[PDB]
Amino acid sequence: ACDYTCGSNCYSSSDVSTAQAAGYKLHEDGETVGSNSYPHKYNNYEGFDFSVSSPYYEWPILSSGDVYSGGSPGADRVVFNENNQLAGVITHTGASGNNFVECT
Ligand SMILES: Nc1nc2c(ncn2[C@@H]2O[C@H](CO)[C@@H](OP(=O)(O)O)[C@H]2O)c(=O)[nH]1
Ligand SMILES: [Ca+2]
């Protein structure tokens, strides 16, 4: 069973934690990875009703289970804040253009 489902992608809590930790570290260190420079601010144009407070940061979560290190970031992301709290898991999959939808 999946803790989070993004399109056809199945994620467990552990996957999420592993990814969040990686992105948060980078965020702490003032460093980024990839041509799109992750992690980076997440504005929330979508208007999701997160339980955690802003500001938000986006970091890719891979279907492979590997931690993001460059190249295609795929369509899934984990969204975290300054306190390292999980805001949510979102995806471009099944979303119009470059918008996002929440994973279920
Ligand atoms: N759709 C969306 N993109 C955002 C937001 N905040 C910043 N962006 C950046 O604008 C880019 C346009 O989609 C997004 O790319 P991403 O695919 O790299 O995650 C994202 O990185 C937001 O709230 N919504
Ligand atoms: Ca997994």
Instruction: Give the 3-state secondary structure of residue 34.
Output: coil
Q: Check: CB of residue 41 under 8 Å from CB of residue 58.
A: yes
Which residues, other chains included, contact 78 with Cβ-Cβ below 8 Å and sequence gap of 6+? Answer: 16, 19, 20, 23, 58, 59, 60, 61, 86, 88, 89
Which residues, other chains included, contact 65 with Cβ-Cβ below 8 Å and sequence gap of 6+? Answer: 15
Which residue shows structure tokens 């492979």? 64
Nearest one of 80, 99, 77, 98 to 89, comparing CA atoms: 77
Q: Resolution for this model in angstroms, one decimal place?
A: 2.0
If you write DSSP's letter for every residue of 43-83 in order, what string do you get?
--TT----SSPSPEEEEE--TTSPPP-SS---SEEEEEETT
d(CA 15, CA 98): 24
Structure tokens at 28: 């702490």
* Closest residue to atom 1 of ligand 1, CA basis: 99
β-bridge mates for residue 80, sequence order: 57, 86
> How was this model experimentally determined?
X-ray
| Domain architecture of the chain: domains with CATH | 1-104 (3.10.450.30)
Distance 28 CA to ligand 2 centre (A): 25
78-104 residues labelled b (16+ CB within 10 A) or e (exposed): bbbbeeeebbbbbbbbeeeeeebbbbe
Distance 41 CA to ligand 1 centre (A): 8
Ligand 1 site, residue 44, Cβ cutoff 6 A: yes
Which residues, other chains included, contact 21 with Cβ-Cβ below 8 Å and sequence gap of 6+? Answer: none
